[PDB]
Design a protein around this ligand. Structure first.
Ligand SMILES: *[C@@H]1O[C@H](CO)[C@@H](O)[C@H](O)[C@H]1NC(C)=O
Lengths: 48, 97
């Protein structure tokens, strides 16, 4: 529901959604977009 | 000119402009992940000069290729010449579309 939206708000008003009480599989995140920059700081994306 | 090397390897490939900045030890992107990854402790140097006279022609040219779809990241200095359709969902689908 965060990747299937149609009105990603402008940067002046960055929409902030909270994710709680759920199981996080990032395979859907990988599938749902032809990524351009998966650059990550705090965690290694492979070990997610 | 003042150091003696036990071996020198020359890897050459045509690539777009921004992926030149992509090519560096410890980087990210569709090329640095699925096509060519340099080692983090890379002892070497990179060379990039523009070529619009041999990779271009009237009516265009599409001979070159690149991979955005791989099962996993490319461990450093590995070649992955293979034409396998990336699975999506749970289908053993073998084809385009
Ligand atoms: C958005 O949702 C529809 C719902 O069927 C889905 O088919 C589509 O792939 C989604 N696309 C994006 C870009 O989120």
């Amino acid at each position: 529901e965060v990747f299937n939206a149609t009105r990603f708000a402008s940067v002046y008003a960055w929409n902030r959604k909270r994710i709680s009480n759920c199981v996080a599989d990032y395979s859907v995140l990988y599938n749902f977009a032809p990524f351009f920059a998966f650059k990550c700081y705090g965690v290694s994306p492979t070990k997610l | 000119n003042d150091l003696c090397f036990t071996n020198v390897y020359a890897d050459s490939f045509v690539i777009k402009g921004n992926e030149v900045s992509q090519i560096a030890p410890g980087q990210t992107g569709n090329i640095a992940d699925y096509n060519y990854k340099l080692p983090d402790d890379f002892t070497g140097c990179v060379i990039a000069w523009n070529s619009n006279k041999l990779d271009s022609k009237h009516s265009g040219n599409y001979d070159y290729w690149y991979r955005l779809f791989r099962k996993s990241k490319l461990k450093p200095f590995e070649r992955d010449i293979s034409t396998e359709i990336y699975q999506a969902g749970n289908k053993p689908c073998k084809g385009k579309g």
